[PDB]
């Protein structure tokens, strides 16, 4: 779903023959694991069992990460045209 | 009777119209393309396999609207109100000259929706060439009509731009170029 | 419960249709009860069967089995073109014209047709003449000139009704084929015989008490 | 009147009569369409003749919306006016019509957005347009078979 | 059905005025001749088992689901036949694997 269906490609509009920006990314990285606790705010993170998560009211819910391809394309007056490319490291 | 293809026709029929001819050889073609790699003839797709393509039925639509917008030329007598196009043609014409306009001109369909349904059920590829091929044989018939005088100005015209108008919209369904996303009356636009 | 059409009282139905003074229409049970006079042929069974079988409602279309929509005309007997499947029908209308010339194709006939062709088994499994499908037709609809065949003979010969249109019909917004197929409609619903809102009839044994001679309350059963 | 609704991710609410769902995609002699639906023009039988008269009555009957190109035999006009109706973004059907350029993101959006968005699990691509309507005609097909009884 | 010879449209009918003229909307009349003149019609007999179940009567003996009785098939003279009832009038139809379809279908 992340990768095939969720590709995004719109334009939006607001140095004054810019007329447009052309907003195109799509995701290649997504992963899922396993759920985790922080102990003491600056801990490492640690496996979250499912009791605790039953006892403190916490949310059995693994971490996901992503990662993603951007091309911000900018359309000028008169058809000039600059792409601009960013490699998006994996975040979550 | 045996058919047989003939790219003489294309190439006068691109001579009359000035386009060149791959223009009109890739009608049906001309989806996801610039219009110069059209005219310059590049990346033409093969000619149909199967008589489930696209392209035959879209070949067939076209030699369809010119037989369509035709037959309104010539039957302008029976319309309460005729189509913009052939009005525009002969708003000059008296009443007895429109029917006349029906007894002049001749029928051009032939045979040609039975010869296409058996070259689609037989050979896709030379369904789409005939397809094409009657199209421009049908435009160079009438622009090759020498009497009478007085229609021969009405046909001239109308083949032009009934061939344009199909040539136009082939090159309407093509890639966009660089042109301003503004006009259409909104902040997004979305692909 | 039964929960047939017809005799719908599943659930709440009924209940409601009392309560909520539902207007005939829109009952769904309607049942009457009729008891025949002259309490001497009341008693037998028979008797009270054929008389449910005149009260039944018979309308025009159960007595059909074949109607078709014909943009034909009979102006006198010229020649005039017909549907070809049904072009035979000549010579049994010579036949009708010779045996029938009180009546005539009247001058204001319609280029529209109806050719009926009459269920033989029901009009003989209900006892209806062909004689009272014309007349009741010709009686209420003169607006519409009918046309009947020779039917008593035998099998194999379809009884034939045609049905032409007259100007008086058409004269109403809509065109000539839906005032057409209205017709058909309106004739194709009339009623040869019986009582309007009367789907079925039956007969049924009720108890019910009466007084002898002598004073004594009996209650009867072969009523 | 046979109305054809799709409802996807762009498409939402649009009522279409089917014969221009048909010939938007090509084939718009109305005899091949007709031949889709009932597989056979010149075959016998009960069935293909309900098929026919129900199919002519469904083409002749006038629609509230898409009456401009309801006599339309120009694929790009019937395309260009269901991308007008259904895209989003389009307010002023009038000033984009100049530019061709414009009409032809129009067009070309509206015939990508079909092909992803009309009976997908043929395909989604633009060779796949013909099948697609076969199939479309074999629904209808089965529709107007429950409809026989 | 009646299309357009030039532009395969549908034409309507146009019951005018003693004959049947087919209009196209791009003008095309094709007129009519006898078998054109039938407008509608609507048969009277409760029976569809002709059309309906004849592709369901073909296969059936074939259909395991189906079920048999003990009958001697006249063609191959199998000792087991496959019993079909069709309708309202609840029509019994005798089938086999050989084709013998028992007077009736
Ligand atoms: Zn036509
Ligand atoms: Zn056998």
Redesign the interface.
């Known amino acids: 779903i992340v990768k095939q269906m969720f590709n995004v490609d719109i334009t939006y509009k607001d140095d004054k023959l810019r007329e447009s920006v052309q907003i195109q990314f799509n995701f290649t990285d997504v992963n899922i694991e396993r759920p985790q606790h922080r102990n003491y705010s600056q801990g490492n993170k640690i496996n979250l069992l499912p009791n605790k998560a039953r006892l403190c009211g916490l949310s059995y819910s693994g971490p996901v990460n992503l990662a993603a391809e951007v091309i911000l394309t900018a359309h000028y007056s008169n058809g000039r045209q600059e792409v601009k490319r960013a490699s998006i490291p994996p975040f979550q | 009777e045996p058919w047989t293809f003939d790219y003489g026709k294309i190439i006068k029929t691109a001579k009359i119209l000035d386009i060149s001819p791959a223009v009109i050889e890739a009608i049906g073609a001309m989806e996801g393309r610039s219009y110069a790699d059209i005219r310059e003839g590049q990346g033409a797709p093969p000619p149909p396999t199967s008589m489930d393509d696209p392209r035959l039925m879209a070949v067939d639509s076209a030699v369809r609207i010119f037989l369509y917008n035709y037959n309104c030329l010539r039957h302008v007598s029976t319309f309460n109100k005729p189509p913009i196009h052939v009005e525009r043609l002969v708003k000059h014409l008296s009443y007895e000259e429109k029917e006349d306009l029906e007894k002049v001109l001749p029928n051009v369909v032939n045979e040609y929706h039975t010869t296409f349904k058996h070259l689609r059920v037989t050979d896709p590829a030379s369904a789409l060439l005939y397809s094409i091929e009657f199209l421009c044989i049908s435009f160079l018939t009438l622009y090759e009509i020498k009497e009478p005088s007085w229609v021969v100005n009405i046909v001239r015209e109308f083949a032009l731009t009934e061939l344009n108008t199909i040539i136009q919209s082939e090159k309407l369904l093509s890639k966009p170029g660089a042109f301003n996303f503004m006009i259409f009356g909104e902040d997004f636009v979305c692909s | 419960r039964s929960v047939a059409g017809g005799t719908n009282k599943s659930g709440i139905v009924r209940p409601q249709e009392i309560f909520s003074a539902k207007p005939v229409e829109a009952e769904q049970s309607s049942e009457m009860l009729l008891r025949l006079k002259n309490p001497e042929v009341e008693t037998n069974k028979t008797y009270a069967q054929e008389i449910a079988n005149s009260i039944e409602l018979i309308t025009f279309e159960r007595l059909i089995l074949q109607w078709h929509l014909l943009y034909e005309t009979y102006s006198s007997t010229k020649k005039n073109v017909m549907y070809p499947d049904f072009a035979s029908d000549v010579e049994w209308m010579t036949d009708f014209l010779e045996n029938h010339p009180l009546l005539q194709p009247p001058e204001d006939i319609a280029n529209w047709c109806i050719r009926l062709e009459l269920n033989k088994t029901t009009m003989i499994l209900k006892s209806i003449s062909l004689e009272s499908i014309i007349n009741s037709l010709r009686a209420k609809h003169p607006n519409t000139y009918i046309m009947h065949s020779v039917e008593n003979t035998a099998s194999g010969i379809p009884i034939i009704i045609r049905i032409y249109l007259r100007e008086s019909a058409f004269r109403r917004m809509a065109t000539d084929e839906k005032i057409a197929v209205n017709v058909v409609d309106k004739l194709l619903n009339s009623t040869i015989r019986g009582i309007p809102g009367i789907k079925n009839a039956n007969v049924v044994k009720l108890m019910r008490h009466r007084v002898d001679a002598q004073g004594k309350l009996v209650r009867l059963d072969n009523i | 009147a046979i109305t054809i609704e799709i409802n996807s991710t762009k498409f939402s609410k649009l009522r279409i009569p089917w014969y221009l769902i048909f010939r938007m995609f090509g084939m718009t002699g109305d005899d091949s369409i007709i031949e889709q639906v009932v597989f056979d023009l010149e075959s016998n039988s009960l069935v293909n003749t309900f098929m026919i008269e129900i199919l002519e009555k469904s083409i002749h009957v006038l629609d509230p919306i898409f009456q401009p190109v309801q006599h339309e035999l120009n694929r790009e006009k019937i395309i260009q006016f269901l991308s007008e109706k259904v895209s989003k973004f389009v307010s002023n059907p009038s000033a984009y019509k100049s530019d061709e350029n414009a009409v032809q993101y129009l067009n070309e959006r509206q015939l990508t957005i079909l092909d992803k968005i009309l009976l997908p699990h043929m395909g989604q691509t633009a060779d796949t347009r013909v099948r697609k309507l076969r199939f479309l005609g074999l629904l209808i097909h089965k529709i107007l078979l429950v409809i026989m009884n | 059905?009646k299309?357009c010879?030039?532009?395969?449209?549908?034409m309507?009918?146009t019951?005018v005025?003693?004959n049947?003229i087919f209009?196209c909307?791009?003008?095309?009349?094709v007129q009519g001749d006898?078998?054109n003149?039938?407008?509608?019609?609507?048969?009277?007999?409760t029976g569809?088992m002709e059309?309906k179940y004849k592709i369901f009567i073909k296969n059936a003996p074939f259909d395991p689901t189906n079920c048999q009785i003990k009958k001697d098939c006249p063609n191959c003279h199998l000792d087991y036949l496959t019993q079909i009832c069709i309708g309202s009038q609840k029509i019994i139809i005798l089938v086999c694997r050989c084709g013998y379809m028992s007077n009736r279908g």
């Open positions: 059905m299309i010879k030039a532009c395969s449209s549908c309507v009918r019951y005025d003693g049947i209009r909307s791009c003008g095309e009349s006898s078998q003149l039938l407008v509608s019609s609507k048969v009277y007999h569809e059309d």
